[PDB]
Amino acid sequence: TLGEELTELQGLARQIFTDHATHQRLRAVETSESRIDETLWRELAGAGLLGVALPEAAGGAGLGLGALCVLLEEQGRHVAPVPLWPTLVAALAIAEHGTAEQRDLLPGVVDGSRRLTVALEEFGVGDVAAPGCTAVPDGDGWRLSGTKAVVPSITGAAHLLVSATGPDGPGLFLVDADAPGLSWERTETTSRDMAGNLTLDAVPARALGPAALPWTLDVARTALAAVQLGVASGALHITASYLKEREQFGRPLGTFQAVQHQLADCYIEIEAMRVCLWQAVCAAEDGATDGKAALVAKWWADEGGLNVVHRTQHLHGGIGVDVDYPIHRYFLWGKQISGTLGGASADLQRLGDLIAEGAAS
Amino acid sequence: TLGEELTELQGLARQIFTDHATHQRLRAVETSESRIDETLWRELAGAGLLGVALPEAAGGAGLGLGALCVLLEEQGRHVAPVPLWPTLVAALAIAEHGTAEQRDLLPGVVDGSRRLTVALEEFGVGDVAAPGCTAVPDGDGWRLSGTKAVVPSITGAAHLLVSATGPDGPGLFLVDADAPGLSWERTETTSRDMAGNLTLDAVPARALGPAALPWTLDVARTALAAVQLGVASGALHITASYLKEREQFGRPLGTFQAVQHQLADCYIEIEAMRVCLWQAVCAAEDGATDGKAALVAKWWADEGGLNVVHRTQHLHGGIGVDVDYPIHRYFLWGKQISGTLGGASADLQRLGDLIAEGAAS
Amino acid sequence: EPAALSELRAELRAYFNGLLPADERRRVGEQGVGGERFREVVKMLGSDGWLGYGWPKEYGGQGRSISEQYVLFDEVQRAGLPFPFVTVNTVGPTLMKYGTEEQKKKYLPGILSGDIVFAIGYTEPGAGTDLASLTTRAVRDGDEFVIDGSKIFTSGANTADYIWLACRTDPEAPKHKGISIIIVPTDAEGFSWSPIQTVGGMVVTATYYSGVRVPVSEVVGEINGGWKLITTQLNHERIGLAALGGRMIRLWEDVVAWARDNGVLEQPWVRRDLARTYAKLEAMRLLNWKMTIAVENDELTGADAGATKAYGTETHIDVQRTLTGILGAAGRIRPESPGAVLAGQIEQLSRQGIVNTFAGGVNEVLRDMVATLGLGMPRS
Amino acid sequence: EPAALSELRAELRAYFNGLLPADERRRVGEQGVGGERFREVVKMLGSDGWLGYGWPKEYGGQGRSISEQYVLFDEVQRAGLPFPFVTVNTVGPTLMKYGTEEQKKKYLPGILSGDIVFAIGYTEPGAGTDLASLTTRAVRDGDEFVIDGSKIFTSGANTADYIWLACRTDPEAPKHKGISIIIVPTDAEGFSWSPIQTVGGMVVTATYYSGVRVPVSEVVGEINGGWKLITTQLNHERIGLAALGGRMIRLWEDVVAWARDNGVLEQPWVRRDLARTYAKLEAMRLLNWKMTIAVENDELTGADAGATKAYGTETHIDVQRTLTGILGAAGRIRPESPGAVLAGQIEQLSRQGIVNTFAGGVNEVLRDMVATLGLGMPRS
Ligand SMILES: Cc1cc2c(cc1C)N(C[C@H](O)[C@H](O)[C@H](O)COP(=O)(O)OP(=O)(O)OC[C@H]1O[C@@H](n3cnc4c(N)ncnc43)[C@H](O)[C@@H]1O)c1[nH]c(=O)[nH]c(=O)c1N2
Ligand SMILES: Cc1cc2c(cc1C)N(C[C@H](O)[C@H](O)[C@H](O)COP(=O)(O)OP(=O)(O)OC[C@H]1O[C@@H](n3cnc4c(N)ncnc43)[C@H](O)[C@@H]1O)c1[nH]c(=O)[nH]c(=O)c1N2
Ligand SMILES: [Cl-]
Ligand SMILES: [Cl-]
Ligand SMILES: [Cl-]
Ligand SMILES: [Cl-]
């Protein structure tokens, strides 16, 4: 059945991530130029995990956003350094909103030779739904001028989906990473990713379909919430194990009521995160387009997920800030994810406008 | 010294409130028509406590907003049913912004024969700074038309200060309780006060000075925060005593770490409430007019004060909802106060506009 | 399929409308099991077939699905009417499991028909959270038990026909192993009750048992095996808190509509608070749904039940606080006073929501259990 | 009067400007006591007279007021420079109280002149929150102590001249009564350290003591009476957290200005978050002020110290989280990478604020003490 395939998916990803997201390998990758584990990427491709969410006509399994979320959740459990959500959200945007020519890029994503990223953010106000980056018509193509902020995992990406406002409003456009007029500055982020601040000077581009931008934002929000769920789950698991071991005052820290209550609040928040994630997935597969379910999943990620990784830092005491101990990476990932596409307060504002607008319908 | 006078003030109020805010008397007063203890009112007048904050020329002690806050804090400690903040905030508004004719009402407030209330709220959006109630010029007077919401402790008040918008903007106007065109409907509130929904049909009125409205709102916010501080302090005290007595699992509830931590969070919030209250008082006496300090004190009242009385309900278990046990009144007072002139979210919005405006100065 | 639930919804409105009037609904809903007209409603619902709607047809019920069951609970609350949750959804299903064939025959039909109502007799002045320390005693005399003690906060005892009574039957056993459940008729000689008024408007009771005599066949389950019955009925005591959340969702919707029509919805702070409570209500209702499925399947873990109940009851209070703020000056007006909004329901529910973070399991203890049962944390 | 503090402020900017460059300030400020140029700064500050600014003139200081002292701490942080808080504000004042006349003469002048820096040696792998369980031992040999053990997270041990070392001197006494403070030179034979890098960018150390020998005159206070010294210096270890809050207030102001100038301030959610953090920062700074007055007066209660420290350190984290959100996409950019706002300070401080809810007293234990010492709650 579908659940059995998703269980198989989960076990496979877990084994691959477990074999490569190790003390030694995380340190090697997080001090490299790309901050990307190319070995892990090739292993994922070879196990079919890059293809599992993508269409059959491109060699994938055709299992869609649910399979993507299962893979991303395992990835977050291990803070595994590969750009799965930028590449696979971009690929799902192409699959669902691209031209035939654009969908011909998907086979290379399935087999691991072609990575992508998405440039959905801007400095300042940075309304992701109203990019300041401009798109100008040029024959049957477009030229883009503007700047985008902190494009994730830019190294080795062959193409980028870039949000921009054209004459008919915001849209999503495919750009080759070697396009003329395109340049970036590498910038290191909280999570230790190597992002790019992107400058576009009349860069040639090709549009995706008219619904690509709001669709891609909902999927990206859902995907980020999947990673955050895995980050928080892994953080809680490590912290629970540690608090059984560490004794003070003659007993395990895990026996103190305040410790148990902080752990329980993490557990509660994780359960809440998880059911709202799957509601967002189910809503997307059932053709919802109002955006509320994705924002609810994302707010839980932004607020609950960030609470969890702050509590798991605190519960560790000094060893939790040692960079040779694992938990600090969950803090760094959780913190970065909770602001990606905007933080908790922004997401409440956007969700509140959707609620108000729907009530006035 | 001034502090010694404020200490004397506090002990006197404490004794009077302790003698009359008893199990029997609170029940008698909260089931009466007025919900006002006239005996307590006369005792307060006779001890000079109604006059302590008012000017010497009216027979008061001239000790201003600080003395008022000391008295209100003791009042909240005992949930004592008398309309001190409506009468004395109105009287301070008259003292500082009234005409000579209006200040001639103050002797009757000092000696206890004359009470007042304030009508600062409206149903709906209810922006207290932009009343929908209208003020029309009529010779050297005014006529007011509109409605005001839930005017506190309306019974026995001889005059009301009513906020309204005239041709030159929002203002504050004195109205006699027997004025033609004035009527109200009694309405019982959460705290068990008997408020009045006020209808004004071209009611004769006299203006206070131009700065009366924003001044009175800052003072009222500060005064409400003083009562809330006393409510939260008294609630915490009762709850601490109870948790020493009640045993489960063979030991006092007070020994459970989660119980100690809930009590500590109340303590912390009360300390925060208290220093911000006194900053608001000091700012008003130092002539600040920006309103930020009063809103900070009020937000702490609205959010911290409400948190305290929810925690002290929870920590009592079933007996805390018994109306024959004291703590539920602190819940009712805390809850009502935390919404008076607006709740925590409104106060953050107003404070955020002041911050933004001051930064753009 | 979802057309069927819609149709069920519309049928139940017509039906409750033919029973309720206006304020009466919000009057019998505030009193709960302790109210005067409670039995009048129950008997009406029972003879019309709605009490056994979710019961197995083996025991005379319709065997309807969880989806349909929730529509029923949501619509009874919406109508203002009280529903005998404890008796129909808590006692009956524990009897169906642990009752003798004889016990089932005496009680289940009258429960079904709306003729028998039960009240829960657990809590004592000395044994609240530490329920396993209860001391109300039942001593063997022959084939009778003699019951001496008292209970406190016995909701509905003034309107019930029987008490589901937790008693100490073996004073020398481990505390968890010394307890039995005994059914005590409320007309028994030596039984008495006195009212307790709550800040929320409900009247519950203290109940007293002085030499009360009950045949030994009125013990449910095995003697000294009462703890597993207590837990079984306490777990079923979450399907009610799920329906309670359903009611707060409806009130949230009503507040959205109210704020839309008077401009309060144009305030940024209001929109943000409605967004935050929407998101927390979404998690609650989804967790409630999963946990109802588990409980009616006999697969709910202690960790998940505790996490869901503590999260849901704290969310009801968060939503109550937040919607009260949105209501502005009217947020403080009690039911039946002029200017109340939505008949004062959110004002009155704020004074009641404070109960459910310690009733049906104390949220501190539920968090302990989440840590120990859910994460394997050591005790002591 | 407030003109004097203004003038002090303006003088200290000119002064620090003549020392700092650009990024160097945020580079030595991130490393803290463990950084390479730390001693270089300390010695400069010391010879220029700023280290004893708040010390009593009896011990060679200027005796300046708390207001002036806070201006100094706020301006050093603003400049990026590290200040020897622990040595000047924590060790010196405990020595002035419990030191021999001899001890004061050996240490205080070099502290004053910026020539002596101390590191705190409390925490062990087996004794963190339960510091009174420490096992590093110091045994009498004659008029020498022989010290064997290790400590962990000894900040500045790589740059300090002496360790303020908590040792077990009486293995048979109550744990609180078996401890002494001993000053160990960092050039002593048998002393060694190794680096520990933190997620926040700081390097602290583990320190090791293998047969280290120190004269018995290097015990501060009475032998086995070390616990009162530990607490004294831990209480003085709050004047630093007050200055830390001062730094978050400045950063809050800078974020207001930044959001004003790029339109982020026009977002309702931003305004609301700035309002909430303003209100929480106001309470923090006022509580810090009261508590500094108390501590320099020898009148701070355990309840108030614990409440103020736990509130302030949790508020620093709340403000860090909230300002990061307001910064948008730039909120995630590390110092020294392109696009960082305010040199990435709030990003880096977010990775450090997590320390101070468990350093200088563990906030859970501080809440225990608030309940027991502040409200009289029973223990155990
Ligand atoms: C309106 C209403 C209706 C009902 C009931 C109550 C009310 C108010 N109940 C009673 C309910 O079950 C009872 O109140 C709880 O079991 C709590 O017991 P106590 O009230 O004695 O609080 P108790 O004194 O045990 O605990 C009080 C507070 O202490 C704290 N606490 C307790 N143990 C702790 C721990 N281990 N660790 C940390 N904190 C701890 C919690 O904050 C708790 O809320 C009831 N009962 C019944 O038998 N039949 C019924 O029908 C009802 N219905
Ligand atoms: C950057 C930096 C710098 C320094 C230091 C640390 C760090 C990270 N410290 C060490 C600091 O004092 C130490 O980390 C704390 O005392 C906590 O001890 P543990 O780290 O062993 O946590 P430990 O394992 O004791 O406790 C870990 C967590 O368990 C919980 N906990 C503990 N006891 C509890 C209880 N009773 N009830 C409930 N929950 C409880 C808390 O959540 C706590 O945070 C230090 N030390 C030193 O000697 N000199 C120095 O200079 C410094 N400086
Ligand atoms: Cl770089
Ligand atoms: Cl009335
Ligand atoms: Cl019932
Ligand atoms: Cl130092």
From TrEMBL, chains A, B:
PANTHER family: ACYL-COA DEHYDROGENASE (PTHR43884), ACYL-COA DEHYDROGENASE FADE28 (PTHR43884:SF20). Residues 215-333 form the Acyl-CoA dehydrogenase/oxidase C-terminal domain. It comes from the Bacteria. Its cofactor is FAD. Keywords: FAD, Flavoprotein, Nucleotide-binding, Oxidoreductase. SUPFAM superfamilies: Acyl-CoA dehydrogenase C-terminal domain-like (SSF47203), Acyl-CoA dehydrogenase NM domain-like (SSF56645). Gene3D superfamilies: Acyl-CoA dehydrogenase/oxidase, N-terminal domain (1.10.540.10), Butyryl-CoA Dehydrogenase, subunit A, domain 2 (2.40.110.10), Butyryl-CoA Dehydrogenase, subunit A, domain 3 (1.20.140.10). This is Acyl-CoA dehydrogenase domain protein. Residues 4-112 form the Acyl-CoA dehydrogenase/oxidase N-terminal domain. It comes from Thermomonospora curvata (strain ATCC 19995 / DSM 43183 / JCM 3096 / KCTC 9072 / NBRC 15933 / NCIMB 10081 / Henssen B9). GO terms for molecular function: acyl-CoA dehydrogenase activity; flavin adenine dinucleotide binding. Belongs to the acyl-CoA dehydrogenase family. The lineage of its organism: Bacteria, Bacillati, Actinomycetota, Actinomycetes, Streptosporangiales. FAD binds at residues 246, 256-257, 314, 318.
TrEMBL record, chains C, D:
GO terms for molecular function: flavin adenine dinucleotide binding; oxidoreductase activity, acting on the CH-CH group of donors. Belongs to the acyl-CoA dehydrogenase family. This is Acyl-CoA dehydrogenase domain protein. Its cofactor is FAD. Residues 119-203 form the Acyl-CoA oxidase/dehydrogenase middle domain. Transmembrane segments: none annotated. It comes from the Bacteria. Residues 7-115 form the Acyl-CoA dehydrogenase/oxidase N-terminal domain. Residues 224-371 form the Acyl-CoA dehydrogenase/oxidase C-terminal domain. Keywords: FAD, Flavoprotein, Nucleotide-binding, Oxidoreductase. Pfam families: Acyl-CoA_dh_1, Acyl-CoA_dh_M, Acyl-CoA_dh_N. InterPro entries: Acyl-CoA_Oxase/DH_mid-dom, Acyl-CoA_Oxase/DH_mid-dom_sf, AcylCo_DH-like_C, AcylCo_DH/oxidase_C, AcylCoA_DH/ox_N, AcylCoA_DH/ox_N_sf, AcylCoA_DH/oxidase_NM_dom_sf, Mycobact_Acyl-CoA_DH.
